[PDB]
Design a protein around this ligand. Structure first.
Ligand code: FAD
Length: 456
DNA sequence: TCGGCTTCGCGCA
DNA sequence: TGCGCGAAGCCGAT
């Protein structure tokens, strides 16, 4: 569909049809940004070829009721900033409320749209909406991967067992799919309040707020400023100050040596391709660049691969055969501790290290990457069943992580509990052959006491 | 039919 | 802290 700096492998057709004489509609769901967005860039190119304007539509669903105010405010503030950014480029943005399968189909007919484009997400609920829209529209429907550097359907045609099998496939396609982004051209032709939906949503989620003993909210909203501009500042400071020591200190939660980009990456407020572009050009420690590029390229995009080819990604069925046989054999082992969902959520376990990891999650909304493995693994050790641990870990991860409800969350929890993208280890009680992590193992790798005291 | 597995624990400089 | 080894099942290059 036209374009010079435009790889057609990034786009794929979801429904054929006659191209109408109306504007091109970019159904924005996962990549909530204006810059470095192929889906918006593909939409603009199609609109330019048909001499029609491009418009952006965003449907706010009832899914926010399953999470907290921390995610709702982070997303909505960025949407307000994005609204002004698209206005400066003469691109109007429409915000609907309701079921996307019903609202997008009504919007496509009332607005007389000619072409429908959306960004890619391997989540189950995104696929259900697409099927409902396909059955309710008669215009062409395209789908652009704006979240991965190499399109998810292109990087592999099957579920990848581990990273060392997916790594050569991804890095071979980098010289083709790693490139600069063209500027978003403004519109030539021109043709609900987000402040009201913020107040309405906040009031709804107020009774479910995480509070301390004295009714004070646990969440500290100053650690991450939401928005496209604020995302770029974080990436700049990571390259300048932290990328040099990332390789040595990534597994030390006492040092803030991570990139902190996951909240922005999840909501799409910054493109992972942009970060990789800048990281590649940066002159820093060769070991740290390789370690960082491995996380944001290999392990990020294999989480999309995991969820795209396994629709039961959030279930015990998705675990490999050896892990399922190992976890089943130990179902009758006596657990040294059994905690309920309520006890885990309030950080009332016997392990001060686990409790502190939970307190980082409750208060900041971003648990450290190393402690997240220890966090989910201990849930498996102190729960009734592998199913209950998966359910509890997914519940606490989506409710409280800013980067939650993400394919990284499900694949990461799958790695911790079911050994997805991992291998077998020493046979143990309860967890079987799943990789084990101990408090004493953390003590020799980082100052565990300093971490505990920072979060009570 | 081997070789090596993100993110392991453990003994030893 | 940094390093080598143990302990485990399997993909994939042949
Ligand atoms: C049990 C568990 C739950 C997690 N929950 C989430 C989640 O809800 N949402 C989320 O985005 N990530 C989650 N992570 C993945 C990973 O821990 C986060 O990407 C990271 O901790 C966020 O901090 P950062 O962006 O500064 O990390 P960095 O070290 O700076 O990583 C750079 C980027 O690489 C990607 N990445 C890094 N580590 C991983 C990983 N292990 N798996 C997949 N991608 C990775 C992310 O996009 C991340 O932003 C989870 C991991 C585990 C083990």
């Amino acid at each position: 569909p036209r374009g010079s700096h435009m790889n057609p492998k990034r786009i794929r057709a979801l429904k054929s049809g006659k191209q109408g004489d109306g504007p091109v509609v970019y159904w924005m769901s996962r990549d909530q940004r204006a810059e470095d967005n192929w889906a918006l860039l593909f939409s603009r190119a199609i609109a330019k070829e048909a001499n029609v304007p491009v418009v952006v539509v965003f449907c706010l669903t009832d899914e926010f009721l399953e999470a907290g105010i921390r995610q709702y405010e982070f997303m909505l503030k960025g949407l307000q900033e994005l609204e002004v950014s698209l206005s400066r480029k003469k691109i109007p943005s429409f915000f609907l409320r309701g079921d996307p399968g019903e609202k997008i189909s009504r919007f496509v007919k009332d607005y007389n749209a000619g072409t429908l484009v959306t960004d890619f997400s391997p989540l189950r609920i995104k696929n259900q909406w697409i099927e409902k829209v396909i059955s309710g529209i008669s215009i062409p429907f395209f789908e652009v991967d704006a979240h991965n550097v190499v399109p998810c359907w292109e990087a592999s045609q099957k579920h990848e067992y581990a990273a060392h099998t997916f790594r050569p496939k991804l890095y071979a396609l980098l010289p083709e799919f790693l490139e600069e982004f063209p500027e978003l051209e403004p519109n030539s032709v021109t043709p609900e309040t987000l402040s009201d939906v913020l107040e309405t949503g906040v009031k709804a989620l107020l009774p479910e707020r995480a509070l301390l003993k004295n009714k004070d909210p646990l969440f500290e909203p100053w650690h991450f400023e939401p928005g496209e501009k604020a995302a770029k500042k974080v990436m700049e400071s990571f390259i300048a100050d932290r990328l040099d020591s990332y390789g040595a200190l990534r597994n030390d939660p006492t040092k803030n040596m991570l990139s902190n980009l996951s909240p922005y990456l999840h909501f799409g407020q910054i493109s992972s391709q942009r970060v990789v572009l800048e990281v590649e050009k940066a002159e820093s420690n060769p070991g740290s660049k390789k370690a960082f590029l491995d996380e944001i390229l290999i392990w990020k995009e294999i989480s999309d691969n995991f969820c795209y080819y396994n629709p039961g990604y959030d279930g015990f069925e998705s675990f490999p055969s050896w892990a399922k046989e190992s976890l089943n054999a130990h179902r009758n082992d006596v657990r040294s501790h059994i905690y309920t969902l309520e006890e885990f959520e309030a950080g009332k376990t016997h392990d001060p290290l686990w409790n502190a990891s939970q307190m980082e999650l409750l208060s900041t909304g971003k648990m450290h990457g190393y402690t997240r493995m220890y966090w989910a693994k201990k849930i498996l050790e102190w729960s009734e069943s592998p199913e209950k641990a998966l359910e509890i870990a997914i519940c606490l991860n989506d409710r409280y992580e800013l980067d939650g409800r993400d394919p990284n969350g499900y694949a990461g929890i799958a790695w911790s509990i079911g050994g997805v993208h991992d291998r077998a280890w020493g046979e143990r009680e309860v967890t079987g052959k799943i990789r084990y992590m101990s408090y004493e193992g953390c003590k020799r790798k980082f100052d565990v006491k300093l971490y505990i005291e920072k979060y009570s």
